[PDB]
Amino acid sequence: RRRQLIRQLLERDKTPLAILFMAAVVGTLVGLAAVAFDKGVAWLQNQRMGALVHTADNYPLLLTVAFLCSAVLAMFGYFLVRKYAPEAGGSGIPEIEGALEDQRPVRWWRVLPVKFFGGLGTLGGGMVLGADGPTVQIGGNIGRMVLDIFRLKGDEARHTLLATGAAAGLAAAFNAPLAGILFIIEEMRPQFRYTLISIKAVFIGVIMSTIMYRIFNHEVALIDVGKLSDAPLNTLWLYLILGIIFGIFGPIFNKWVLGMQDLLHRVHGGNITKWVLMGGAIGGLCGLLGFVAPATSGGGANLIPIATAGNFSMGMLVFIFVARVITTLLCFSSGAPGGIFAPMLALGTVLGTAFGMVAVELFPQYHLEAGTFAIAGMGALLAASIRAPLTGIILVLEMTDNYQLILPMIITGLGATLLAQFTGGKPLYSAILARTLAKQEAEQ
Amino acid sequence: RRRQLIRQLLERDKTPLAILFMAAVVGTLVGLAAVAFDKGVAWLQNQRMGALVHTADNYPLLLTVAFLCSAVLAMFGYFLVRKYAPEAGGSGIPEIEGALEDQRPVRWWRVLPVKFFGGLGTLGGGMVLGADGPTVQIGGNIGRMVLDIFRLKGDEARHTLLATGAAAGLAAAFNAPLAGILFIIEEMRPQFRYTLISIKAVFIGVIMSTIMYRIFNHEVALIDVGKLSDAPLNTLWLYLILGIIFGIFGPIFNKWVLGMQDLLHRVHGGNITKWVLMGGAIGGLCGLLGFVAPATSGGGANLIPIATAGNFSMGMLVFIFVARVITTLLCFSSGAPGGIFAPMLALGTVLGTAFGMVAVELFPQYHLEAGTFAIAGMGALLAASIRAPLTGIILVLEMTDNYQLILPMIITGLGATLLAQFTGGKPLYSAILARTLAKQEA
Amino acid sequence: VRLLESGGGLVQPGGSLKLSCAASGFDYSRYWMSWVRQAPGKGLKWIGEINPVSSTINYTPSLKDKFIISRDNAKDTLYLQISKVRSEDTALYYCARLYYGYGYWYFDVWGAGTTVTVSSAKTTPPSVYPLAPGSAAAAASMVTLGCLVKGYFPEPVTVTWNSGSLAAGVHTFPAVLQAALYTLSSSVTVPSSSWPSETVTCNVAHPASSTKVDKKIVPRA
Amino acid sequence: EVRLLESGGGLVQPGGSLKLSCAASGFDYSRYWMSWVRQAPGKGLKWIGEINPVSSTINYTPSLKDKFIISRDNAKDTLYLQISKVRSEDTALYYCARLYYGYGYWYFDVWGAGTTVTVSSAKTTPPSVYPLAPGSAAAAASMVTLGCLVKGYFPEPVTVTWNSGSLAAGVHTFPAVLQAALYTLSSSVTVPSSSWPSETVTCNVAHPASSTKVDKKIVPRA
Amino acid sequence: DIVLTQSPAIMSAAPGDKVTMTCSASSSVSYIHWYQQKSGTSPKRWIYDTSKLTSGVPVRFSGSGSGTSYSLTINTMEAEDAATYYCQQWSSHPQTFGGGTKLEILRADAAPTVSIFPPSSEQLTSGGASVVCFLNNFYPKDINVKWKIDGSERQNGVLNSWTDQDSKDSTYSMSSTLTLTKDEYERHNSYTCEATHKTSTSPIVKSFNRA
Amino acid sequence: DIVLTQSPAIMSAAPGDKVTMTCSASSSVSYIHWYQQKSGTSPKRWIYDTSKLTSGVPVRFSGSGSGTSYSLTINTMEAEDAATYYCQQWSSHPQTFGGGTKLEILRADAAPTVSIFPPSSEQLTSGGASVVCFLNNFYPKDINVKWKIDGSERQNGVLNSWTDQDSKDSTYSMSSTLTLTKDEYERHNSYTCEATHKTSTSPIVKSFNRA
Ligand SMILES: [Br-]
Ligand SMILES: [Br-]
Structure with a gap:
C-alpha cells in the first residue's frame, strides 16, 4: 500500500471550504447558546436568593421557600425531559458520543429546547450539576441542526460538525478552548476506528465559541487562584501517591453512580409522575442545602478558590467531600439534565486539599503549600472516573494558569488513570453508552 | 455494529501492563539520551568560544579558526550519516513517521550512534538546526531497541513503544510534556487509518523523559520572556492578519526546502566526499557567522526573548529574518542531521515582532506591545509549514507561559493553517516522507 | 486601591515642578498610568500616558520637553514634570490608571488631584x-x-x-x-x-x- | 544586586526585649521564604525560624512559646524578629536569610551582613x-x-x-x-x-x- | 483630535423625570465612556463601552448611541444624581473628553437659616474685622443679602460665596463676609445682615451689637 | 535532631595544595550544603545538594558523600580560600549546621617583632598604669609571654589578645597588657616582657626602666 499512502500523504489536511465555514457558524451559535444558558442559570439562582429576603424573618418559612423553589424548578426540568426528550437526561455526552458511532439519533428539534430549558431548571435550582453536559449536548445538536438545514452530505461533515459542536460546547462552558478540542481528540471521537473529524474545523468552531464567550464574560475568569509555589523534584513522589488514591476511588465512584441509577429507577420504575416528583424532592433538598450548608450543594465552581487558599478546616474538607459525594450521586444518577464534569473538579480539589493539608503537617522540610496538591487533584476525578486525563490536565491548566505545576498535575493524573485501570474500572461516559445500547437491545 | 461496540466499550483503555512498564523504560532512556545530547552540543559550542580566546588578536586568523572548527565538526556529521546511516540525515521525523505506517525501517543499531554523534557535530558547530530532529529520531529508535531487546510481540507494542519514544524525545528537547503527547496525536500517528497507539503509555514515557530533563536542568527553562500584556478583543483582528501572512509564506518556504533539497543534491551528485566537503563549507560558514553576527546562525533560541522585548530595531529584524531564512535552508536541505522545528520558532518570533512594531505605530489607541505578536508568531511557521498547529500552540505555550495570549495564538495558528491549505501548501514532514517513498519505487 | 498625587502648589512663570502619584492597592506594574488635568472650573484634558515598562510614552500635542512622564515601578509612583510653565498650567492634575473592556481604553481609577498655581x-x-x-x-x-x-x-x-x-x-x-x-x-x-x-x-x-x-x-x- | 540588610541589635538588659528588622532590596521579596539564623560568639550557626510568603506558616526552632515572633511585612519589604525575655544565651550575631532549594533539599540562599545583640546589665x-x-x-x-x-x-x-x-x-x-x-x-x-x-x-x-x-x-x- | 460636545451644558430636572444628555463627535467614534464628577470629588468611571455600567452604578442609568451621537440616560433621575457628567472616547488617538453636562436638581422650597458671627478676638489682635453671616440650606439658589451697619447700608468690602447643590438634600448655602479695619469696626455698634429669599416676603435678619 | 560535626575543627595548608574537610551526621542525611564565611562578611552559599557548585565558586572546590558522611575538597588551594566552611543539612526537620572548619593559610615560621610601651602620662594622671607589649607578625600562632617587674615574674593583671591570621602576610599578632595602679607602678623600676616562641629557645626580651 506504499503507492496508496504516497497519494494520501500529499492530500492530507485539505478539509472542504464548505465544512470550514460551517464549523464557524456552529461555533458561534454554540457560543451564543452557552452564554445565554449561562446567564439564565444565574438569573434563576438570583431570583431564588431575593426570595429568601422577602421572607428572612420566619426561619421555618425560610427553609420552606428554599425547598419549594428548587423542587419546582427540578420537576420542571425532569418533566421537560421525560415528556419530550429522554436522551437529554443526565449529561448528554454519552449520547453525542453514540451519535459519533452512528448508534443514537441527534433529535435536535426535541433536545435543544429540552436540554436548554430543562437544564436551566435543574442547574438554576442549585442542584449539583455542571453546565458542561447541557452545553456539550446542546452544542452537538446545534451542529446537527446546521447540518440538516444546509443539507450537507458526507461522513466528514456529519462527524465534524457533530464534533466541533460539542467541542465548541465544552470550550464555552469553561472558557477552555484547548480543553474542548482535546476532549474530542481524546474522548469523544469514535474510539475503535478511523474517522474524518476534521481537526482544523473543530478548531474553527472552538475559536468562535470562545470569542462569543469573551464578548459576554470578560474581566472575570471562572476561577482565580493566583500564582502558587513551585514543586521541588523531591516532592513529586507525593503527587504520585495522590494519584494512586484517586485511582482506587475513581472506579469506586463509578460503581456508585451506576448502582444509584438502578436504585433510583426502582423508585419510579419509569413512571413519569413518580420520577418528576422524585426529582422535585432532590431539587428541593439541594435548594435547602443551598441555604443551610452551601458547600454541600451547587455545581461547585465557587468553593474551588476557597479550598485552594487553605481557608477550610480539615474537618470541613472531610465533611464537604462526604456530603458532596452524596448530593453529586443523588443529582446525577437521578437523570436530571446536567453534566457531572464540573462537580468532579470540586470533589477533586477538596480531596487534594485535604491531602496537601496532611502533607504539609507531615513534611515541613518540603515547605509545602496545600494549594498545590489541590490543583493536582482537581483534574484527578476526571482522570480516574472518566479516564480523559489529557483533557482534565489541560482543562485545569486553562482554568488555573499555574503551569509551573504541570509535572505534579500530570503525575497525579496518570497515577489516577493507571490505578483506575488496574483496580478494574471503566470510563464513565463509555459505560453509560453501553448500558444504554444494552437496553437498546435487551428489549428484543 | 451495536453488539460489537458494546463489547469494545466495556474493554476500553486496558493497555497491557507489559507495554506500560516498557514505556517507562523508554522515556527514562530518551531523557538521559536527550539530556546528554544537549550537554554535548553546548560543550562543543563552548570549546569553539574559548578557542576564539586563544586567537583573539589576529582578526583574519580568528575568522579562520571559527570557520574551520565548525567546518571540521560539520564534516564529521555528514560523514557519520552517509557512511553508516543515511536515513539519519536531516530531521528524521519523516523517517519515524514512515516507520509508524510500517513503511521504513528502524535501524537502531545504526542510527542511535549516528544521529547522536552526527548531531553533536552539526549542532555543536553552531549550525542552524534544532536538537528536535535528533531527539525525536533517537527517541523512536530507543523505543524500537527496547522492543527488540525484550522481544515484545504485537502491532500495538510495536506502534506504542515507537511512539512514546518519539514523544519522550520532543518533550526532552523543549521541556514540553504536553507538546510531546500532542505531537503524536496530531502529526506522527498514522494519519489515515486507525492505530493501536496507547495514549496512556505515551503519557508515561513523556513523564519519565521530562523528569530526566528536570533533574539535570532545573531552575532554568529554555526561554523566559516575562509576563506580557493581555489582548483586548478589539485587537484580535490584528492576529488574524498575521496568520494570513504566515499562511502564504509557509508554502513558499516549503517549496524552498523541498526545492533546495534538490539543488544541493546536484552539487555533490550523491557522492560522500563532495557532500561532506559541501557540508563543511555550510557548517564552516555557520561557525563563522556565529562570531561576526551570531543571530544569523545557531538554533536561534537565543534571540527569541531579545526579539520579544523589542530589543531589536526594525532594520535588524528584517535582516535577521532574511539571513535566517537562508542559513535555515542551507543547513536543513543539505541533509545535515538536525531538526527544523527550533529554527522555525526563531523565524516566527522574528516575523511576529516585526509585525508587532508596525501595529504599535499604526494604532496607539490599542496600547500594544510588540512582544505579544512575537508570541503569536513563534509557532505560526509550525502551523503553516508542518501543519501541526495544536502541537505548535501548546509547544509555545509550554515554553513562554503567557496563557493570556491563548486566543491570539490560536487565531494566528488557524490563520496560518487555513491560508496554507488555500494556497496549496502541504504538511512538510508528510511532503518529505512522500518524496522519500517516491524514490523508493523508482 | 488608591492613587495619591502630590507635589502641587506654587511655581513662578517659566519654572518647573515634579508631581508624584503614590499608587497602592494593585500590581502597579502591568498597568498603564496616565495624567489628566482640569483647569479651574473647566473640563478634562489628557496630558499623556506611559506603559508599564516605560517603553511607550505618549503625550498630548505639547512642545519640546513641556511634560516629562515617568514611572518608578520600584516605588509604585508615577511622575510628571512640567517646565517652561505658563498660566495655562495652573490646573488640577489627576493621576489615573488606564484600562479597557472591549479594547477602547478608559481612565479606570482616578486620584484625588494635586493643584498647581502659576503665580509670581x-x-x-x-x-x-x-x-x-x-x-x-x-x-x-x-x-x-x-x-x-x-x-x-x-x-x-x-x-x-x-x-x-x-x-x-x-x-x-x-x-x-x-x-x-x-x-x-x-x-x-x-x-x-x-x-x-x-x-x-x-x-x-x-x-x-x-x-x-x-x-x-x-x-x- | 540582592541585598539583605538587617538592623536593630544593640545592648539590651537581661529579661528585656528587642525587634530586629531585615530590609530586603533587589528581588521579589514575596515568593521567598525568609529565615533568621544567629551565631553565638565563638560558637556555630543556629537556626531560629522561618516564614512563608503569605505568613500562613511560621516555623521556629525547639525553643519556648512567645520567645521568638517572626513576622514579615511584604509591603515594606522587611522581615522581623521579636525576642522576649532576653538572656545572655541570646547574645549573638543575628543573620537574616532568603530560602531556596535545588533538588528540593532546602538551603540558605542569600544571607545578610548581620546585627549583634549584646545582653548585659x-x-x-x-x-x-x-x-x-x-x-x-x-x-x-x-x-x-x-x-x-x-x-x-x-x-x-x-x-x-x-x-x-x-x-x-x-x-x-x-x-x-x-x-x-x-x-x-x-x-x-x-x-x-x-x-x-x-x-x-x-x-x-x-x-x-x-x-x-x-x-x-x-x-x-x- | 475628535472634538466631543455635550448636549446641554447645564440642565435641570425634578427627581422622577427621565433625563437624557447627549454626546456628539466631530468624527465617528465607537464605544465611548462616561464619567460622573460630583462636586469636590474626582471623576468616577460611570458608563463604559457605550452602554456598560461600572460596578456600583445604579441601574437607573443607561448608555447608548453610535457613529456621532451618543447619550447617557437616567430613567427616573434621583436627587443624588446631581453631578457634572463627562463623555470620553479613545477609539481614535489621542483620546478626548467632552465638555460637561451639569445636572441640577429641582426641589421643593426650603428657607435659609441665618447665623451671624462677630469678629473674633484673635482677629482684632491682628487689626482686622470680618463679620460673617451664614445662610445655610435654602432653595432656590436666588438669594439677596443686605449688610446694615447701625441701620445704614454697607456695600463696600462685602464678599459672598455659594456652595454647589448638595448631593443629598439638593439645597444651597451661602456665606457673606464684611471686612473692615479694626478702627472702622470700633466706630460703630450694631451690625446686621438681611436675607431675602422667595420663602418669605419679609427679609430674614440677624444682628448683634458691639456693646 | 540531626547533629552535624565538622571534623578538622581548625586546619592549615599551603597554597597550591589539596584540602579536605568532613561533615558527619548522627542519622542519615541527603544532599548537604556548604557555606564559606570570612570574618565580618555574610556567610556565602558555597555548595548545595552534596555536589553542586554555586555561580562563581571556582572549580577547585568540590563535594562528595552519602548517608552519614560528606566532605568538601579544594584541589589546589588559593590564598582566598582561608575561611570557615559550615556544612548544613535540611533532609530532616529541623535543619542543622556543623561546628565549622576554620581553614587558615600555612606558611613559613616567623619570629615576633616585640615592642614594649610604658604608661602614658595621660593614663597615670587618672591613676592607672597599663604596660602594653606588642608581639607582632609570627607563625605559628602559639606563643608565650612572660612579664617581669624588676626581674621578678608577675602573673596578676595581665590580659592577652591574639589577632586572627593576617590577610597580607598570613601571620599572627598578640598584645599583652599589664595593668597596675599608679601607686604600684611606682614601687618598681624595670618592666620587662618576654616572648617565648617556637622559632628560638632564647626569648625576645624587650623592656624599659623609668629610672
Ligand atoms: Br449521561
Ligand atoms: Br527530513
Missing part, C-alpha cells in the same frame, strides 16, 4: 479665627458654629471638624481671592446639647505650606 | 584613649611601632583608624577583652623611621554607642 506671588499660610455665637446664646435645638480661614496662598485648604467625626452638618465655602490672597469659611451645625458641653474644633490644613491648624471654638463669656 | 561607657609612644631611650631601628590603648568602654564595638585611614598598611587592631563589665583593646601601627616623629601619626577612635569621636596624636616621650 508668595506662599502664605492661613490664619484661622473661630466663629462662636455672640453673647446672645439664643438657643434653638441646634447651634451653628463656624471658623474663618483668611489670608493663605495658594489654594487649596481642607477643613474638617473633630477630625472628620463631625461629617454631617458641614458647609465649607469656596474661597475668594483679593490682593492675591484667599479667604474661606466653614459652617458646622450641632445640637445645642452637644455644645459647649463637648469640644468642637475645626482642623484647617494648608499643604502648600505643610501647615495644620486645629482651632477650638470656645464660647464668649 | 552593664552600662554604656565611653573609652579613654591613651597613646603608646616608644620609651625615652627608644631602640631607634629602621621601623618604629606605635600604638594606642582604648581602655574601659561598653559595649562593643569601637573603630580604630590611623591618619583617617590613609595609613592602611602595617596596622593591626586587637580583639577587645572584657573585664569587670568593661572592654579594653589596643591598635598597633608600624611606620618607617623616616615618617615619625618627622610627620604626624594619629589614631582616630570612634565608639558610637557613647557618641565618642577622638583623635589621639602620638608624640615622642621625654
Whole structure:
C-alpha cells in the first residue's frame, strides 16, 4: 500500500471550504447558546436568593421557600425531559458520543429546547450539576441542526460538525478552548476506528465559541487562584501517591453512580409522575442545602478558590467531600439534565486539599503549600472516573494558569488513570453508552 | 455494529501492563539520551568560544579558526550519516513517521550512534538546526531497541513503544510534556487509518523523559520572556492578519526546502566526499557567522526573548529574518542531521515582532506591545509549514507561559493553517516522507 | 486601591515642578498610568500616558520637553514634570490608571488631584479665627458654629471638624481671592446639647505650606 | 544586586526585649521564604525560624512559646524578629536569610551582613584613649611601632583608624577583652623611621554607642 | 483630535423625570465612556463601552448611541444624581473628553437659616474685622443679602460665596463676609445682615451689637 | 535532631595544595550544603545538594558523600580560600549546621617583632598604669609571654589578645597588657616582657626602666 499512502500523504489536511465555514457558524451559535444558558442559570439562582429576603424573618418559612423553589424548578426540568426528550437526561455526552458511532439519533428539534430549558431548571435550582453536559449536548445538536438545514452530505461533515459542536460546547462552558478540542481528540471521537473529524474545523468552531464567550464574560475568569509555589523534584513522589488514591476511588465512584441509577429507577420504575416528583424532592433538598450548608450543594465552581487558599478546616474538607459525594450521586444518577464534569473538579480539589493539608503537617522540610496538591487533584476525578486525563490536565491548566505545576498535575493524573485501570474500572461516559445500547437491545 | 461496540466499550483503555512498564523504560532512556545530547552540543559550542580566546588578536586568523572548527565538526556529521546511516540525515521525523505506517525501517543499531554523534557535530558547530530532529529520531529508535531487546510481540507494542519514544524525545528537547503527547496525536500517528497507539503509555514515557530533563536542568527553562500584556478583543483582528501572512509564506518556504533539497543534491551528485566537503563549507560558514553576527546562525533560541522585548530595531529584524531564512535552508536541505522545528520558532518570533512594531505605530489607541505578536508568531511557521498547529500552540505555550495570549495564538495558528491549505501548501514532514517513498519505487 | 498625587502648589512663570502619584492597592506594574488635568472650573484634558515598562510614552500635542512622564515601578509612583510653565498650567492634575473592556481604553481609577498655581506671588499660610455665637446664646435645638480661614496662598485648604467625626452638618465655602490672597469659611451645625458641653474644633490644613491648624471654638463669656 | 540588610541589635538588659528588622532590596521579596539564623560568639550557626510568603506558616526552632515572633511585612519589604525575655544565651550575631532549594533539599540562599545583640546589665561607657609612644631611650631601628590603648568602654564595638585611614598598611587592631563589665583593646601601627616623629601619626577612635569621636596624636616621650 | 460636545451644558430636572444628555463627535467614534464628577470629588468611571455600567452604578442609568451621537440616560433621575457628567472616547488617538453636562436638581422650597458671627478676638489682635453671616440650606439658589451697619447700608468690602447643590438634600448655602479695619469696626455698634429669599416676603435678619 | 560535626575543627595548608574537610551526621542525611564565611562578611552559599557548585565558586572546590558522611575538597588551594566552611543539612526537620572548619593559610615560621610601651602620662594622671607589649607578625600562632617587674615574674593583671591570621602576610599578632595602679607602678623600676616562641629557645626580651 506504499503507492496508496504516497497519494494520501500529499492530500492530507485539505478539509472542504464548505465544512470550514460551517464549523464557524456552529461555533458561534454554540457560543451564543452557552452564554445565554449561562446567564439564565444565574438569573434563576438570583431570583431564588431575593426570595429568601422577602421572607428572612420566619426561619421555618425560610427553609420552606428554599425547598419549594428548587423542587419546582427540578420537576420542571425532569418533566421537560421525560415528556419530550429522554436522551437529554443526565449529561448528554454519552449520547453525542453514540451519535459519533452512528448508534443514537441527534433529535435536535426535541433536545435543544429540552436540554436548554430543562437544564436551566435543574442547574438554576442549585442542584449539583455542571453546565458542561447541557452545553456539550446542546452544542452537538446545534451542529446537527446546521447540518440538516444546509443539507450537507458526507461522513466528514456529519462527524465534524457533530464534533466541533460539542467541542465548541465544552470550550464555552469553561472558557477552555484547548480543553474542548482535546476532549474530542481524546474522548469523544469514535474510539475503535478511523474517522474524518476534521481537526482544523473543530478548531474553527472552538475559536468562535470562545470569542462569543469573551464578548459576554470578560474581566472575570471562572476561577482565580493566583500564582502558587513551585514543586521541588523531591516532592513529586507525593503527587504520585495522590494519584494512586484517586485511582482506587475513581472506579469506586463509578460503581456508585451506576448502582444509584438502578436504585433510583426502582423508585419510579419509569413512571413519569413518580420520577418528576422524585426529582422535585432532590431539587428541593439541594435548594435547602443551598441555604443551610452551601458547600454541600451547587455545581461547585465557587468553593474551588476557597479550598485552594487553605481557608477550610480539615474537618470541613472531610465533611464537604462526604456530603458532596452524596448530593453529586443523588443529582446525577437521578437523570436530571446536567453534566457531572464540573462537580468532579470540586470533589477533586477538596480531596487534594485535604491531602496537601496532611502533607504539609507531615513534611515541613518540603515547605509545602496545600494549594498545590489541590490543583493536582482537581483534574484527578476526571482522570480516574472518566479516564480523559489529557483533557482534565489541560482543562485545569486553562482554568488555573499555574503551569509551573504541570509535572505534579500530570503525575497525579496518570497515577489516577493507571490505578483506575488496574483496580478494574471503566470510563464513565463509555459505560453509560453501553448500558444504554444494552437496553437498546435487551428489549428484543 | 451495536453488539460489537458494546463489547469494545466495556474493554476500553486496558493497555497491557507489559507495554506500560516498557514505556517507562523508554522515556527514562530518551531523557538521559536527550539530556546528554544537549550537554554535548553546548560543550562543543563552548570549546569553539574559548578557542576564539586563544586567537583573539589576529582578526583574519580568528575568522579562520571559527570557520574551520565548525567546518571540521560539520564534516564529521555528514560523514557519520552517509557512511553508516543515511536515513539519519536531516530531521528524521519523516523517517519515524514512515516507520509508524510500517513503511521504513528502524535501524537502531545504526542510527542511535549516528544521529547522536552526527548531531553533536552539526549542532555543536553552531549550525542552524534544532536538537528536535535528533531527539525525536533517537527517541523512536530507543523505543524500537527496547522492543527488540525484550522481544515484545504485537502491532500495538510495536506502534506504542515507537511512539512514546518519539514523544519522550520532543518533550526532552523543549521541556514540553504536553507538546510531546500532542505531537503524536496530531502529526506522527498514522494519519489515515486507525492505530493501536496507547495514549496512556505515551503519557508515561513523556513523564519519565521530562523528569530526566528536570533533574539535570532545573531552575532554568529554555526561554523566559516575562509576563506580557493581555489582548483586548478589539485587537484580535490584528492576529488574524498575521496568520494570513504566515499562511502564504509557509508554502513558499516549503517549496524552498523541498526545492533546495534538490539543488544541493546536484552539487555533490550523491557522492560522500563532495557532500561532506559541501557540508563543511555550510557548517564552516555557520561557525563563522556565529562570531561576526551570531543571530544569523545557531538554533536561534537565543534571540527569541531579545526579539520579544523589542530589543531589536526594525532594520535588524528584517535582516535577521532574511539571513535566517537562508542559513535555515542551507543547513536543513543539505541533509545535515538536525531538526527544523527550533529554527522555525526563531523565524516566527522574528516575523511576529516585526509585525508587532508596525501595529504599535499604526494604532496607539490599542496600547500594544510588540512582544505579544512575537508570541503569536513563534509557532505560526509550525502551523503553516508542518501543519501541526495544536502541537505548535501548546509547544509555545509550554515554553513562554503567557496563557493570556491563548486566543491570539490560536487565531494566528488557524490563520496560518487555513491560508496554507488555500494556497496549496502541504504538511512538510508528510511532503518529505512522500518524496522519500517516491524514490523508493523508482 | 488608591492613587495619591502630590507635589502641587506654587511655581513662578517659566519654572518647573515634579508631581508624584503614590499608587497602592494593585500590581502597579502591568498597568498603564496616565495624567489628566482640569483647569479651574473647566473640563478634562489628557496630558499623556506611559506603559508599564516605560517603553511607550505618549503625550498630548505639547512642545519640546513641556511634560516629562515617568514611572518608578520600584516605588509604585508615577511622575510628571512640567517646565517652561505658563498660566495655562495652573490646573488640577489627576493621576489615573488606564484600562479597557472591549479594547477602547478608559481612565479606570482616578486620584484625588494635586493643584498647581502659576503665580509670581508668595506662599502664605492661613490664619484661622473661630466663629462662636455672640453673647446672645439664643438657643434653638441646634447651634451653628463656624471658623474663618483668611489670608493663605495658594489654594487649596481642607477643613474638617473633630477630625472628620463631625461629617454631617458641614458647609465649607469656596474661597475668594483679593490682593492675591484667599479667604474661606466653614459652617458646622450641632445640637445645642452637644455644645459647649463637648469640644468642637475645626482642623484647617494648608499643604502648600505643610501647615495644620486645629482651632477650638470656645464660647464668649 | 540582592541585598539583605538587617538592623536593630544593640545592648539590651537581661529579661528585656528587642525587634530586629531585615530590609530586603533587589528581588521579589514575596515568593521567598525568609529565615533568621544567629551565631553565638565563638560558637556555630543556629537556626531560629522561618516564614512563608503569605505568613500562613511560621516555623521556629525547639525553643519556648512567645520567645521568638517572626513576622514579615511584604509591603515594606522587611522581615522581623521579636525576642522576649532576653538572656545572655541570646547574645549573638543575628543573620537574616532568603530560602531556596535545588533538588528540593532546602538551603540558605542569600544571607545578610548581620546585627549583634549584646545582653548585659552593664552600662554604656565611653573609652579613654591613651597613646603608646616608644620609651625615652627608644631602640631607634629602621621601623618604629606605635600604638594606642582604648581602655574601659561598653559595649562593643569601637573603630580604630590611623591618619583617617590613609595609613592602611602595617596596622593591626586587637580583639577587645572584657573585664569587670568593661572592654579594653589596643591598635598597633608600624611606620618607617623616616615618617615619625618627622610627620604626624594619629589614631582616630570612634565608639558610637557613647557618641565618642577622638583623635589621639602620638608624640615622642621625654 | 475628535472634538466631543455635550448636549446641554447645564440642565435641570425634578427627581422622577427621565433625563437624557447627549454626546456628539466631530468624527465617528465607537464605544465611548462616561464619567460622573460630583462636586469636590474626582471623576468616577460611570458608563463604559457605550452602554456598560461600572460596578456600583445604579441601574437607573443607561448608555447608548453610535457613529456621532451618543447619550447617557437616567430613567427616573434621583436627587443624588446631581453631578457634572463627562463623555470620553479613545477609539481614535489621542483620546478626548467632552465638555460637561451639569445636572441640577429641582426641589421643593426650603428657607435659609441665618447665623451671624462677630469678629473674633484673635482677629482684632491682628487689626482686622470680618463679620460673617451664614445662610445655610435654602432653595432656590436666588438669594439677596443686605449688610446694615447701625441701620445704614454697607456695600463696600462685602464678599459672598455659594456652595454647589448638595448631593443629598439638593439645597444651597451661602456665606457673606464684611471686612473692615479694626478702627472702622470700633466706630460703630450694631451690625446686621438681611436675607431675602422667595420663602418669605419679609427679609430674614440677624444682628448683634458691639456693646 | 540531626547533629552535624565538622571534623578538622581548625586546619592549615599551603597554597597550591589539596584540602579536605568532613561533615558527619548522627542519622542519615541527603544532599548537604556548604557555606564559606570570612570574618565580618555574610556567610556565602558555597555548595548545595552534596555536589553542586554555586555561580562563581571556582572549580577547585568540590563535594562528595552519602548517608552519614560528606566532605568538601579544594584541589589546589588559593590564598582566598582561608575561611570557615559550615556544612548544613535540611533532609530532616529541623535543619542543622556543623561546628565549622576554620581553614587558615600555612606558611613559613616567623619570629615576633616585640615592642614594649610604658604608661602614658595621660593614663597615670587618672591613676592607672597599663604596660602594653606588642608581639607582632609570627607563625605559628602559639606563643608565650612572660612579664617581669624588676626581674621578678608577675602573673596578676595581665590580659592577652591574639589577632586572627593576617590577610597580607598570613601571620599572627598578640598584645599583652599589664595593668597596675599608679601607686604600684611606682614601687618598681624595670618592666620587662618576654616572648617565648617556637622559632628560638632564647626569648625576645624587650623592656624599659623609668629610672
Ligand atoms: Br449521561
Ligand atoms: Br527530513
